[PDB]
Amino acid sequence: MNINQLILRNLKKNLRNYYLYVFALIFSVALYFAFVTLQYDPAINEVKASIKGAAAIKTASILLVAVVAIFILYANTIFIKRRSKEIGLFQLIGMTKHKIFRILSAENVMLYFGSLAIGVAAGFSISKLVLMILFKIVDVKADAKLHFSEQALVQTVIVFCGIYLLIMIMNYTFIKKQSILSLKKISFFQMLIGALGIVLILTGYYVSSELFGGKFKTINELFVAMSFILGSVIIGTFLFYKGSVTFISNIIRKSKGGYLNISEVLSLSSIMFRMKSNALLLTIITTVSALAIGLLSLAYISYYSSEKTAEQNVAADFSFMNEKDAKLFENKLRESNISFVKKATPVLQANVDIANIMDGTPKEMQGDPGNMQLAVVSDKDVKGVDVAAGEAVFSGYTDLLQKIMVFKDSGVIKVKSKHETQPLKYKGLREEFLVSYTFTSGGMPAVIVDDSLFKQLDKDKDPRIQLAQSTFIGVNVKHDDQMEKANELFQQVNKKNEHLSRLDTSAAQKSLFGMVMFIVGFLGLTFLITSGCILYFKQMGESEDEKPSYTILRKLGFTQGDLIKGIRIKQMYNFGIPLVVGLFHSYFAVQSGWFLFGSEVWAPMIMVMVLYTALYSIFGFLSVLYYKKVIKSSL
Amino acid sequence: MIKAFLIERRSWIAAFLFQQALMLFIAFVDPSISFGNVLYMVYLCILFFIIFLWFRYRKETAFYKSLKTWENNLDVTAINEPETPFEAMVERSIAGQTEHLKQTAARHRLALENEKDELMAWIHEVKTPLTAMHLIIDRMEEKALKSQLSYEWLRIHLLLDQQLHQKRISFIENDLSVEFIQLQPLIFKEIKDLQSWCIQKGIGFDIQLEAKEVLSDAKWLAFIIRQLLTNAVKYSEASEIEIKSFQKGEQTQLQVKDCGRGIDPKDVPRIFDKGFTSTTDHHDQASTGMGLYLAKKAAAPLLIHIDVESEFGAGTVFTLTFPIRNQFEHVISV
Amino acid sequence: MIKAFLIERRSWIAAFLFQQALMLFIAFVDPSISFGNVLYMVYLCILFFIIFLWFRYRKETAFYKSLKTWENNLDVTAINEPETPFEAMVERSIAGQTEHLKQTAARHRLALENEKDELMAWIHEVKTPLTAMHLIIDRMEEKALKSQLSYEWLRIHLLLDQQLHQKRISFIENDLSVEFIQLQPLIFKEIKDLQSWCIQKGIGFDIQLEAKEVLSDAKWLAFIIRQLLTNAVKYSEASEIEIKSFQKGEQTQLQVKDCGRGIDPKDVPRIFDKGFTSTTDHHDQASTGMGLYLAKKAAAPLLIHIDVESEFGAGTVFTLTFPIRNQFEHVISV
Amino acid sequence: HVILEANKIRKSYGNKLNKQEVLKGIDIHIEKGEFVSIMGASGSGKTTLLNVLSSIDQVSHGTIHINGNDMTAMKEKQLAEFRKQHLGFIFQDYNLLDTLTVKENILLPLSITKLSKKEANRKFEEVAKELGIYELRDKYPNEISGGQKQRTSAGRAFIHDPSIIFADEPTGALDSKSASDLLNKLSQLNQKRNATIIMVTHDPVAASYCGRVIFIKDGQMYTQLNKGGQDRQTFFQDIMKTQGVL
Amino acid sequence: HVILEANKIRKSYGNKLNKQEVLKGIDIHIEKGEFVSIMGASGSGKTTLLNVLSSIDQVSHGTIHINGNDMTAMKEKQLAEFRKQHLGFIFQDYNLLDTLTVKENILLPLSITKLSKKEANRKFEEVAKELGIYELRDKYPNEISGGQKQRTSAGRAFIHDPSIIFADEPTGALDSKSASDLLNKLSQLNQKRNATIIMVTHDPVAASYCGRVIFIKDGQMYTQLNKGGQDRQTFFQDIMKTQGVL
Numbered sequence A: 001m002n003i004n005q006l007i008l009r010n011l012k013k014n015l016r017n018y019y020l021y022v023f024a025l026i027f028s029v030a031l032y033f034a035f036v037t038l039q040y041d042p043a044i045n046e047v048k049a050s051i052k053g054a055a056a057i058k059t060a061s062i063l064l065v066a067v068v069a070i071f072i073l074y075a076n077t078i079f080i081k082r083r084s085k086e087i088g089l090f091q092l093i094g095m096t097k098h099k100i101f102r103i104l105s106a107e108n109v110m111l112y113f114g115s116l117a118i119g120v121a122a123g124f125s126i127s128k129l130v131l132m133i134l135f136k137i138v139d140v141k142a143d144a145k146l147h148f149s150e151q152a153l154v155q156t157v158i159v160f161c162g163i164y165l166l167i168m169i170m171n172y173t174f175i176k177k178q179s180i181l182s183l184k185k186i187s188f189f190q191m192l193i194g195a196l197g198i199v200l201i202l203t204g205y206y207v208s209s210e211l212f213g214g215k216f217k218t219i220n221e222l223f224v225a226m227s228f229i230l231g232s233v234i235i236g237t238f239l240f241y242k243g244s245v246t247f248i249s250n251i252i253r254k255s256k257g258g259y260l261n262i263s264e265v266l267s268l269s270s271i272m273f274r275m276k277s278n279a280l281l282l283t284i285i286t287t288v289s290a291l292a293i294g295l296l297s298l299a300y301i302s303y304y305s306s307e308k309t310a311e312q313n314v315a316a317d318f319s320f321m322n323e324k325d326a327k328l329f330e331n332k333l334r335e336s337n338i339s340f341v342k343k344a345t346p347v348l349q350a351n352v353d354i355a356n357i358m359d360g361t362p363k364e365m366q367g368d369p370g371n372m373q374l375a376v377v378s379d380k381d382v383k384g385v386d387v388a389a390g391e392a393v394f395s396g397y398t399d400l401l402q403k404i405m406v407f408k409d410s411g412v413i414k415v416k417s418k419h420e421t422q423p424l425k426y427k428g429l430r431e432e433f434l435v436s437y438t439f440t441s442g443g444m445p446a447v448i449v450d451d452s453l454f455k456q457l458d459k460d461k462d463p464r465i466q467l468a469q470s471t472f473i474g475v476n477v478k479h480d481d482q483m484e485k486a487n488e489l490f491q492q493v494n495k496k497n498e499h500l501s502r503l504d505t506s507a508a509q510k511s512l513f514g515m516v517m518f519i520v521g522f523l524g525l526t527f528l529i530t531s532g533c534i535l536y537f538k539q540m541g542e543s544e545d546e547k548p549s550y551t552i553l554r555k556l557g558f559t560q561g562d563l564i565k566g567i568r569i570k571q572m573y574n575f576g577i578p579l580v581v582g583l584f585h586s587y588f589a590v591q592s593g594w595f596l597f598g599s600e601v602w603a604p605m606i607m608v609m610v611l612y613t614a615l616y617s618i619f620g621f622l623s624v625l626y627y628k629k630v631i632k633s634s635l
Numbered sequence B, C: 001m002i003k004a005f006l007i008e009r010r011s012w013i014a015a016f017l018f019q020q021a022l023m024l025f026i027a028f029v030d031p032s033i034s035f036g037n038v039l040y041m042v043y044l045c046i047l048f049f050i051i052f053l054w055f056r057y058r059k060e061t062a063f064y065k066s067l068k069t070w071e072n073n074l075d076v077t078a079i080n081e082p083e084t085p086f087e088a089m090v091e092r093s094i095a096g097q098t099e100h101l102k103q104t105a106a107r108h109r110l111a112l113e114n115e116k117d118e119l120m121a122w123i124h125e126v127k128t129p130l131t132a133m134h135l136i137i138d139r140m141e142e143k144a145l146k147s148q149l150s151y152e153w154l155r156i157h158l159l160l161d162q163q164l165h166q167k168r169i170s171f172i173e174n175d176l177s178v179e180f181i182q183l184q185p186l187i188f189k190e191i192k193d194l195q196s197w198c199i200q201k202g203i204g205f206d207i208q209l210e211a212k213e214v215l216s217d218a219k220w221l222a223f224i225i226r227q228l229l230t231n232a233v234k235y236s237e238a239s240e241i242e243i244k245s246f247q248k249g250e251q252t253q254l255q256v257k258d259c260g261r262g263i264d265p266k267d268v269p270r271i272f273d274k275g276f277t278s279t280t281d282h283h284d285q286a287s288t289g290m291g292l293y294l295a296k297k298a299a300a301p302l303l304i305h306i307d308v309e310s311e312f313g314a315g316t317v318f319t320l321t322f323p324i325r326n327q328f329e330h331v332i333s334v
Numbered sequence D, E: 001h002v003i004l005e006a007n008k009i010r011k012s013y014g015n016k017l018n019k020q021e022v023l024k025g026i027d028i029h030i031e032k033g034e035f036v037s038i039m040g041a042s043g044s045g046k047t048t049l050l051n052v053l054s055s056i057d058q059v060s061h062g063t064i065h066i067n068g069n070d071m072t073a074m075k076e077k078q079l080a081e082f083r084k085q086h087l088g089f090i091f092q093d094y095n096l097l098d099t100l101t102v103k104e105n106i107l108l109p110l111s112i113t114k115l116s117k118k119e120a121n122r123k124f125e126e127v128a129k130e131l132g133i134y135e136l137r138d139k140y141p142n143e144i145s146g147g148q149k150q151r152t153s154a155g156r157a158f159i160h161d162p163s164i165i166f167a168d169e170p171t172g173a174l175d176s177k178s179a180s181d182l183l184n185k186l187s188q189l190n191q192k193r194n195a196t197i198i199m200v201t202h203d204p205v206a207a208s209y210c211g212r213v214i215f216i217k218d219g220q221m222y223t224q225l226n227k228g229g230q231d232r233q234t235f236f237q238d239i240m241k242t243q244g245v246l
């Protein structure tokens, strides 16, 4: 007859088991098209940040294409595995390998391109909620419109055509390694490998605990610990997944004197002889999931720590540098009619010594001991803190600086002046900065002294570099009544925007960290769903590979309840081990990461972990249902 | 019984909640669309949904209660008149399958009855030629050839009479009859029809009939008596078969005692097995075995227990316990 | 079927679409909810609803389709395992309302084959003593009583052979055989089987045949030539039987020419109806007459075609037909 | 006595246009302690017969009475439980799980009753000594010869004290030496303790060891033989002649 | 002449620790046009011999030559081409595509040779008329009798005119009547077109239709018989008795 008719009938009466294939293809196409049309939309530039806005999406697409390609590659097994007896029979009749490959590739192309055509329409339907969420995160509200962005379609078509071109090679290889067909104990080395993996994981966690506990308080004692911890954790988890589960299962297996029933035989034998089979994949999944969760937590912390950081950079409510521009602003704020408390607070670069306030090692000397550019102020400007003679209080917390630069708790402040020295004691605490970040460079804690000491230091006039303007010109504002109008008037006065503002600087950080959080969350959710589905596919394959032990064990009359009980236990273990391992890795990766920053949060971790658990539970339940269906149709 | 309906109606509730959650989320994200009105009227929609749930519960669960009562009852009207196609399909399938089974059972029974009637017709119209055979054969003069021919003819005729009575035991239940028969003429008849056997084999007999009356259907009484007689002949040879009748117990016991081999004490409980054939004599295997079996089972109304006062060597007392003449009124009623 | 599913689930569709319509209508009239931005929400909700309906239909419409498949045709086991609460109901009801009929039919059929087996054993147990009686009667010397007794024996054993062949008809479905056979030895032995009737009635036989090839069973052809020849000699008196075969076309006319009375032309069409028997002769009650009807009912599967030309005062013409060498392949094909 | 009773067993395959009947009026009488072999052919109803008497498949018509119980009354679950607790099975091919030791594999069916540890060990040791595989106690079923796997399957069959042991041509995948060894072990096990065996086969050499041979022909049994008292050679020659008659 | 030839072909299975050798010195000289057979008990290395002779498997040691060529020193592409051109196959289990009718299912191997449809049409016409399955041309293989399916499978192996036909036991699923009919038609097709049908069976009356019965015991041939002029019955007697000798 005509081979085309054969292909048509084959597709028509075979397109009943290939639903997960089409669903996975549709999901991948929809997600990729949504992301790309978010990129090439011209309304994205409404955000305001340092980055171009559309620059990150190229890297995000580069990262996403590999994930979707791997997902489709691991999904192709559903289509390709069943065609074994047909290939054997076709070889028996006479048709060669190339004709069989072409016959299969025709149906593969038909299904693939049908699903690709369906996927584009679905993505355009949802390609407005993603944009709405993006606008909600960065808080820029103009509108939300639906556009097609043909370039996105071109890119998606090219990418997925390349992916199918790659799939063809796997199809050809599987067809190649087929023929006419019929149409181990444990050595002593495994003990060492398992013990080694366990001990490296334990010691990596332990040394990680000491790091953020307070030790390694020196710059050169940090990089070595980081690299050692990373390498030890990676190699330890790899050894765990390739010999530390067989070792830990053999103890229980031999504990009972060779006497098992159906539940233990199924569960223990499957786990012990199948977990070791694939080991590289599980390591990748767990490590990448932990890294993604940690990165998202870091981004959320950095985003939420925006108002305080902006207030730190912006000493007053509004900041000025140019005296002529300050005088102009003084003239043009009269029509603004706002209570201005602008002060010409004078500050002088007076040198002190903090070298003797080192509680770590004497080798930390930090540039100039007694000729630093530290700032001092009199007591008339600030009256909140009351300090007696011979005492002082540091003002500033500086987590990013606290991670390295640490002062002694009881280190007497020996002011190494040219001739004199003023011992100082720590009684109070303050955090009020009277200078902008432009003059403190890396960040110097504020020092408040008496007027007489300020006069003596300024009349000393040490030949040291001095700020361009001494009396910082910064103005405060009354109760929050006229914020927005003040912002636009200040924006329109500093057309060269060489000045500094609070409500303007407090938005670039929020926008940048919102973009980072969006990218990280989207990629992490996609990867997590894909990794959850790959294990379901593997379990379905292993179910298809274990049917004759259900044909037997049922003729002997074990019914189906016992078998399904054993399967439930097996699935519980198989989906519980990697989940717990990933949870522990994530907990010790997120923990290290607000110690470098400021205080703890504990807010998003619970939500991320509960979602992590829920998706794996769903996939495990689906796997149990598939196993039940396979067992029922055995005898 | 709410739980089952909730279990099978779970996807619709899941879809309802998912729709509410999705539209609430889109209302949250969109600033153009408000939030408070959406939340309030979602609450109103849920309160509206509850009453619809109750209504559909009542209707569908009431229908499934009627099929559950129909599951175990005696009235077919317990099912409601179908309104949805699914219930109509269920009821129609039930009715069709029940009707088909009834039809096939009736067809089997009628076919069996017709086969039995055909057998009765054939057996009568083939029995008549044997009467013709006897009439022709009772005229010869030769001795040895004619004697052995009489042997063969008697074997065939007794076979025929016996298993035609076995044919008629199928409807003996509606063919029962009782009347008074004196032993002497009918035992002389049983000697006469076996006079060929009596002359040939020369088996002795004795009639010490202390009680000289028995009761059963005339030809059925003859059947039972030469059943015992022919079983004794098959079992006893050249012995003084003491056919005595003294009433031991309630039943009028025909203490028919042969003087032959008798019944072995080890085999006394076994002689009452269905299809009894005394394998020690191969001529007894040709017997259908119903003889004792049908004698007992059609003697359940006749109340004739085949008692066995057997002693080996002196012969087995074939105690065919015809019940007392009073207990034969039970036989008359049935 | 899709229409039925939509009809039964109509209330839920109505509720969902009513909520969406209320969505749209309320959004249309209040400026706080921009009507232009609610079509998106309604579109998403309706897409989710249609996908969910597709899945739920696919899952739901399995068992009630299986029941409708098992409506009347066959396969009482075709009912699928229930998985929903309301499915575990119809299955149990069906089992409870069909087990009675199943057991009744099984018991009745079992009794049927038990009866047939008992009958067949009976008939063989009959056949043996008649064979012994023939073995002994093949020694006697008389003439007239010889004719009488031998004719009675012939009638008796042909009746028993007919009954054996009827019991064989009961399961004739498993004895088909096709091969090349010749007529001469068959006719010789069967003439040896038909001597005493010819001697008594003074009926001669003459054979002159053209085609001797027959392609059918052996024992059935023996019994069918018995049916035809015995019927002819029952209808022929003092006639030289001119049993001849002429290859007239595709059929070989085994014309049994007899110069006896024959059959009247007025009663020709009824000579092969239900249980036909020659009512002219009274003794034919001994003949079953079932032989003609069983010959009619069993002649179809064995490919023997009958032809008759009957006249009164000239005899009756009989004829059986045999197939060609290119015919015993349709028996596997057509 | 009369452990297996059958009355006109009927079985058919297919439906509508391709319905075929394979069992047509089969009657079986098996006594206690016998050793029965139903010789057949390639296309006769042997495997279907083994399925239908072992309550694996279902008979279209007829009634069976195994140990005095009505087999054709229970629906599925009672059938499975009765099959598990009272029948042992031996097959022609794969019977051993790939991922179990011999000891666990042939102690598996005893685990339901939960007979502690020591007595289970003693029973396993006693049984494994008889078949001569007790040395291969910790090896895996991919490291032993075929005859040893057959002996392992037989040991699993015999351990849990069954009533009727259903075999299906056990020696159909071995060489002559292992064939004779396995058959001799089966006969010795039957002699030591009363273990009925109802196996089907198509080889007179394998059935000469039996005590009674029934010949089946297209689902219709025909002729019987009895070993009686002659030695193996004479009974084998009798089976020779009887099979040659057909 | 001698269209099939073998010299000391040897084959062993297993690896390293476990090793078994089931073919030990086989020498066969099957002659062109002869309806040869191979007879022996199960598990004596029959299907392994069939696989080796057909280049399905590979030899440990030995040389097999067909029609002047060699088999042990060719690559996969040319081996497959030769298997197409000069080989035809039948196996115990029919392998028919339920997606197609009997018509195109039989015509499939000849539909890829770039030929006119009419030639294939009357070729199938002749094949079906010889096999007597012409009428079922337009019926799916899910509504026909088992013997008809088997004859369809057999007729598939004859359409492309193979020089040498192989077969496994082809009467393991048929009835007695169908088996006899199929063997008779195979015998008839022996001498119409000269094709060396090499059956492999373990059934005496099945091999009675052959003329070159060649026995096997455990991996080494024993005897050799010829039809001579016997009438298919005395040959059965001689074959079955010489089987009983072993």
Ligand SMILES: Nc1ncnc2c1ncn2[C@@H]1O[C@H](COP(=O)(O)OP(=O)(O)OP(O)(O)=S)[C@@H](O)[C@H]1O
Binding pocket: D013, D014, D022, D040, D041, D042, D043, D044, D045, D046, D047, D048, D049, E146, E172, E173, E174, E175
């Ligand atoms: N679904 C089916 N499965 C198996 N056999 C079937 C099926 N339907 C019909 N059959 C027929 O049933 C027979 C199978 O063989 P059986 O009669 O059960 O015994 P068997 O032939 O001795 O089995 P083996 O393999 O030789 S032990 C063949 O005639 C098949 O055509």
Ligand SMILES: Nc1ncnc2c1ncn2[C@@H]1O[C@H](COP(=O)(O)OP(=O)(O)OP(O)(O)=S)[C@@H](O)[C@H]1O
Binding pocket: D146, D172, D173, D174, D175, E013, E022, E041, E042, E043, E044, E045, E046, E047, E048, E049, E168
């Ligand atoms: N991979 C294998 N392929 C074939 N036989 C194997 C294999 N591994 C082990 N064997 C054994 O090696 C022997 C080979 O026997 P076979 O060549 O199959 O002869 P056979 O069993 O008579 O042929 P069949 O299947 O009955 S037509 C058998 O005992 C098999 O169990």
